[PDB]
Amino acid sequence: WTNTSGSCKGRCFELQEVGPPDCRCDNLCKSYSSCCHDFDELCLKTARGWECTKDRCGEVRNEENACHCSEDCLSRGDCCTNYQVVCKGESHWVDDDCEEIRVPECPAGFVRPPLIIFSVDGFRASYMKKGSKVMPNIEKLRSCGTHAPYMRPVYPTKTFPNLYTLATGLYPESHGIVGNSMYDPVFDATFHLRGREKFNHRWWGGQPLWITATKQGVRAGTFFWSVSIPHERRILTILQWLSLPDNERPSVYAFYSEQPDFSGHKYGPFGPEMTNPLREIDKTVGQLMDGLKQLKLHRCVNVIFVGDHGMEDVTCDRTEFLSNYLTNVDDITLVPGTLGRIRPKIPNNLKYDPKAIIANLTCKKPDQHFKPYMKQHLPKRLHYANNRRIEDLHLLVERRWHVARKPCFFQGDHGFDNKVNSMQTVFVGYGPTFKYRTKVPPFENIELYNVMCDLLGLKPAPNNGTHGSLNHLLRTNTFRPTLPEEVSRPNYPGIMYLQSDFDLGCTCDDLEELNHTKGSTEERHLLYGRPAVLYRTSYDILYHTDFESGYSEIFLMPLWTSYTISKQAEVSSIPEHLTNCVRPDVRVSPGFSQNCLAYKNDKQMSYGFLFPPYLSSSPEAKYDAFLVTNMVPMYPAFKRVWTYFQRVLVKKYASERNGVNVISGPIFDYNYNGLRDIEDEIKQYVEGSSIPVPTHYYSIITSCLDFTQPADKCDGPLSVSSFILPHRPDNDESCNSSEDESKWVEELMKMHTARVRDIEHLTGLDFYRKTSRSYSEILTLKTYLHTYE
Numbered sequence: 001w002t003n004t005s006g007s008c009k010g011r012c013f014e015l016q017e018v019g020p021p022d023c024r025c026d027n028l029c030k031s032y033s034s035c036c037h038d039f040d041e042l043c044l045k046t047a048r049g050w051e052c053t054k055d056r057c058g059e060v061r062n063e064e065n066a067c068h069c070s071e072d073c074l075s076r077g078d079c080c081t082n083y084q085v086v087c088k089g090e091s092h093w094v095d096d097d098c099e100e101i102r103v104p105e106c107p108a109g110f111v112r113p114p115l116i117i118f119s120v121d122g123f124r125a126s127y128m129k130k131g132s133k134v135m136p137n138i139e140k141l142r143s144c145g146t147h148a149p150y151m152r153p154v155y156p157t158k159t160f161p162n163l164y165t166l167a168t169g170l171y172p173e174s175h176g177i178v179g180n181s182m183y184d185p186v187f188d189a190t191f192h193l194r195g196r197e198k199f200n201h202r203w204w205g206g207q208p209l210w211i212t213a214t215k216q217g218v219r220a221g222t223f224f225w226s227v228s229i230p231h232e233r234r235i236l237t238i239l240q241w242l243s244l245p246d247n248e249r250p251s252v253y254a255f256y257s258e259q260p261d262f263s264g265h266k267y268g269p270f271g272p273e274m275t276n277p278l279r280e281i282d283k284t285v286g287q288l289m290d291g292l293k294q295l296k297l298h299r300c301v302n303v304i305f306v307g308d309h310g311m312e313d314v315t316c317d318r319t320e321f322l323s324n325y326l327t328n329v330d331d332i333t334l335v336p337g338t339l340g341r342i343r344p345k346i347p348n349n350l351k352y353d354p355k356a357i358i359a360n361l362t363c364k365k366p367d368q369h370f371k372p373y374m375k376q377h378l379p380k381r382l383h384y385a386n387n388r389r390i391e392d393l394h395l396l397v398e399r400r401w402h403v404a405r406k407p408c409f410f411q412g413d414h415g416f417d418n419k420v421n422s423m424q425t426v427f428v429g430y431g432p433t434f435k436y437r438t439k440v441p442p443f444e445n446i447e448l449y450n451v452m453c454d455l456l457g458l459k460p461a462p463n464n465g466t467h468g469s470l471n472h473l474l475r476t477n478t479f480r481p482t483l484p485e486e487v488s489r490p491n492y493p494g495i496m497y498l499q500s501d502f503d504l505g506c507t508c509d510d511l512e513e514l515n516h517t518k519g520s521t522e523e524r525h526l527l528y529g530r531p532a533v534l535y536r537t538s539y540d541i542l543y544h545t546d547f548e549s550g551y552s553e554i555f556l557m558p559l560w561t562s563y564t565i566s567k568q569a570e571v572s573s574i575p576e577h578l579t580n581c582v583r584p585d586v587r588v589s590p591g592f593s594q595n596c597l598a599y600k601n602d603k604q605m606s607y608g609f610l611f612p613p614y615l616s617s618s619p620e621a622k623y624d625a626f627l628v629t630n631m632v633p634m635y636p637a638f639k640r641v642w643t644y645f646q647r648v649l650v651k652k653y654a655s656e657r658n659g660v661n662v663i664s665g666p667i668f669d670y671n672y673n674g675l676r677d678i679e680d681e682i683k684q685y686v687e688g689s690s691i692p693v694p695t696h697y698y699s700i701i702t703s704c705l706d707f708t709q710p711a712d713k714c715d716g717p718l719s720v721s722s723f724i725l726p727h728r729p730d731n732d733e734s735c736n737s738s739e740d741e742s743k744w745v746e747e748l749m750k751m752h753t754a755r756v757r758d759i760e761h762l763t764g765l766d767f768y769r770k771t772s773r774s775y776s777e778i779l780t781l782k783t784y785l786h787t788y789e
């Protein structure tokens, strides 16, 4: 209970941690209705607006006013932000030339540059193109500071998952805010964005920046603001806190605005009405910068200008209805709109039949504007599966569309797949620790927490960023990354077995003495060093004319297979006599090998090869491609994809990129946590055998960023694209799979694009250990996602 008759005199926006039964005066008190009865009158002053006028200059200080233009206001830290411009002939910050801030220029008493995060809801990255004509203050931040052309949000591209991701460095599946709306079947409770439950700490996981700071002795200003507090007052409050005594002044601050999200929803991203809210936001930025300048802090503070997600054209006319596909929609609950999550209306309703539902939702309309997924089948890049709050049944919705349960005041919405262009949002960093007039490649918002930690001298809590991947944003305070230690060293087996030692049921139509040393194989096909294996296991390096692999004696297949294809390389067919050829590998024990019998017995499982026979350098070398140690279990459905990739696409990539280096391999993630499975977690084997079945297959495709140089002779920076393809028994995901592979396979692969870093989590491997590049630059390379947009 709150004793409300207390007073907010000399307590306005206190940073005091205060609870029941006492009165509160902080920026969240209204959200709990726990404000002292005089909070409004004392703390939310609105008198005479937010700007000094010439007639107010030198006024006698009236404490009734929202802000002051009195002679004393500067020391008391409560001038209106334009005070000096109007009364002291100063210029607005925006009208001053940009000057590089080489070191922090802070008043005495400041020990480190403060950090202010200026967050804007629904600020689509392409809004920046409007420039200084519309947003002159923001355009100055952007061009003088450090900027990305866009920042990638997390999926779902809505507010609560994205804000909490910014604050923690964690994917939603990890921090627990997997949506604006959620149901937790263990709590048997519903989370609503507005409502009582969301204030319960039990929903929120990980460790947000304000906690990380506090726990390490760095004071934070309160990040959240009760919605009724006007933006002008939020700014004045931040400024006032910045004028506090040395022993009270916070080091980190956050502002937030619900715009331009609100107007975007009403009028759509390209609506003419969007100009006004954007001007209004810019004005708030100008107030902050003018205020910092008055305080002599405009070359002292680091400012981050950042959004949670973008905004797409979405209207009532573009709504799919589940009732068009399903008979009894009143028995399910749907989280609707720009994504779909389905559960039975009655929790744990036994008659709930998700397989039948999915079947009715699969490719039933030629123009179908969503696609059903069991969550473990969603593209791995979304990292959206490992949480009890994420329904098994998901609908990825096509950009510009809505899905609803059954049968216009809006023109815009967001929430779609986070690689969609309209969903991209903004990042600008300005201040002494940031670079001057520097553009950086787009990056994911999960990376920001580490950097904000660096900016504040903090040690980040465990998170999903890759610390160091954003060192190129910063002048100083960079984080020196260290290469992870190899845990398992490889063996280099020679000939140790006789063809007669082998009894695998394999057959092949193969001079005796002419029947594999290192030589130049490493330098030709393994360009960036061997991957390091970061877990305890047993594996062998195997060399070949056309490829190298790190073969696992535990999982009975390569962990990685590496090869280079030159621009001019030739694609050849598999000779008729070799169609079913599998050859034992005398370097490897028959006990550590697969066998062809298990495949003959398994009516549903077939096999493929990691190095493709189609790209062998010679008919002789081609026999290497048929080694049992190059073999992997593949469903016939998957083989349609894999053979098309191997036979047609790799060559196409080599032609287009002036050669390519390829690293392919298996991934096991049966528990859908995005992490390499341990042995006990694998759930499927080839029939009657111990050959484990991968849940996915990866490929990492590298070339020279300077495409004029061949991939194998690259001097400088690298270019990479990767995928993690789901290993599935059907092509139900591809609505056009009945057609030739030229009509559907690349579309599937594009959806399952991935970062090398994603593959590293899933494999326990560490790539690119041996290059001519800095480790930070390599970290940047590993977090790159090729999006095809």
Ligand SMILES: *[C@@H]1O[C@H](CO)[C@@H](O[C@@H]2O[C@H](CO)[C@@H](O[C@@H]3O[C@H](CO[C@H]4O[C@H](CO)[C@@H](O)[C@H](O[C@H]5O[C@H](CO)[C@@H](O)[C@H](O)[C@@H]5O[C@H]5O[C@H](CO)[C@@H](O)[C@H](O)[C@@H]5O)[C@@H]4O)[C@@H](O)[C@H](O[C@H]4O[C@H](CO)[C@@H](O)[C@H](O)[C@@H]4O)[C@@H]3O)[C@H](O)[C@H]2NC(C)=O)[C@H](O)[C@H]1NC(C)=O
Pocket (backbone or CB within 6 Å): 170, 171, 173, 174, 175, 176, 202, 203, 204, 205, 206, 383, 386, 387, 388, 462, 463, 464, 673, 674, 675, 761
């Ligand atoms: C992204 O980055 C994050 C952060 O680094 C990674 O997530 C971590 O993954 C590790 C490895 O699996 C987890 O380690 C296990 O830790 C548990 C106990 O952890 C508890 O304490 C820690 C520390 O305070 C908390 O962070 C944990 O919070 C989780 O659970 C609470 C419970 O409500 C929840 O509110 C949070 O949202 C969060 O949930 C998320 O993770 C859990 C799994 O832990 C998952 O169920 C949920 O859906 C969310 O994803 C938690 O309170 C410990 O028991 C385990 O021990 C195991 O190994 C040891 C070996 O010594 C064995 O002895 C033991 O028997 C177990 O086998 C693990 O150590 C860690 O919890 C988790 N951290 C967080 C915050 O999620 C991701 O993996 C990264 N993602 C990718 C793809 O790289």
Ligand SMILES: O=C1N=C(N2CCN(Cc3cccc(B(O)O)c3)CC2)S/C1=C\c1ccc(Cl)c(Cl)c1
Pocket (backbone or CB within 6 Å): 117, 118, 119, 121, 122, 157, 158, 159, 160, 163, 164, 166, 167, 180, 193, 223, 224, 225, 226, 227, 254, 255, 256, 258, 261
């Ligand atoms: O003062 C604040 N008010 C916040 N609100 C209140 C207003 N909300 C508007 C809203 C509500 C429901 C859905 C959306 B949407 O666009 O998906 C937006 C969003 C949550 S967050 C916030 C401060 C904040 C919170 C987290 C971070 Cl990381 C930072 Cl930098 C700042």
Ligand SMILES: *[C@@H]1O[C@H](CO)[C@@H](O[C@@H]2O[C@H](CO)[C@@H](O)[C@H](O)[C@H]2NC(C)=O)[C@H](O)[C@H]1NC(C)=O
Pocket (backbone or CB within 6 Å): 003, 004, 005, 006
């Ligand atoms: C609720 O708040 C008011 C103000 O703090 C408290 O009123 C005071 O109570 C003390 C003790 O009874 C008196 O000596 C003062 O004269 C009161 N001050 C004023 C200005 O009213 C009241 O006690 C609180 N109620 C509680 C504690 O439940």
Ligand SMILES: *[C@@H]1O[C@H](CO)[C@@H](O[C@@H]2O[C@H](CO)[C@@H](O)[C@H](O)[C@H]2NC(C)=O)[C@H](O)[C@H]1NC(C)=O
Pocket (backbone or CB within 6 Å): 325, 326, 327, 328, 356, 357, 360
């Ligand atoms: C899947 O779609 C079919 C229609 O294609 C639904 O089948 C109908 O179901 C009702 C009641 O079960 C029958 O009276 C109709 O005759 C059926 N139509 C046809 C053409 O078979 C089926 O109900 C749907 N399944 C789900 C889970 O919604």
Ligand SMILES: [Ca+2]
Pocket (backbone or CB within 6 Å): 668, 669, 670, 671, 672, 673, 674, 675, 676, 677, 678, 681
């Ligand atoms: Ca796993």
Ligand SMILES: [K+]
Pocket (backbone or CB within 6 Å): 599, 600, 601, 602, 603, 604, 605, 606
């Ligand atoms: K078979």
Ligand code: NA
Pocket (backbone or CB within 6 Å): 731, 732, 733, 734, 735, 736, 737, 738
């Ligand atoms: Na299909």
Ligand SMILES: [Zn+2]
Pocket (backbone or CB within 6 Å): 121, 122, 158, 159, 160, 261, 308, 309
């Ligand atoms: Zn938002």
Ligand SMILES: [Zn+2]
Pocket (backbone or CB within 6 Å): 122, 261, 262, 265, 414
């Ligand atoms: Zn919104």
